[PDB]
């Protein structure tokens, strides 16, 4: 995604963003099958999917991904934590 964000070609950006979509969804499935829905790593993949959705111009469900990640990060790891801060930073960047 970061190569796709930092490149000028539209076709290359679309192809690499779709590739990152496949990798993120596969990683999320692996984490969900191994650990479960409510765990830190599943929230990591949710936040990554939210950033990627913000990159693929799909802002509708990027917000859903970001609150989905935050509601698992701040629950298990406490309201104030590093990864909670990183996820709310992504959410704020998506908003503004």
């Amino acid at each position: 995604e970061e190569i796709a964000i930092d490149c000028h070609n539209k076709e290359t950006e679309q192809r690499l963003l779709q590739e990152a979509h496949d990798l993120h969804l596969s990683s999320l499935q692996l984490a969900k099958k191994a650990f479960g829905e409510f765990n830190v790593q599943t929230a990591k993949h949710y936040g990554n999917l939210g950033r990627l959705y913000q990159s693929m111009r799909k802002f509708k469900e990027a917000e859903e991904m970001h609150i989905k990640a935050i509601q698992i990060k701040e629950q298990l790891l406490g309201q104030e934590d590093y990864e909670v801060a990183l996820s709310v930073g992504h959410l704020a960047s998506l908003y503004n």
């Binding site: 990591k44 990183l86 930073g89 960047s93």
Partner: peptide, 7 residues
């Protein structure tokens, strides 16, 4: 740019 690093 436009966001922070991925978790």
């Amino acid at each position: 740019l436009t966001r922070n690093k991925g978790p």
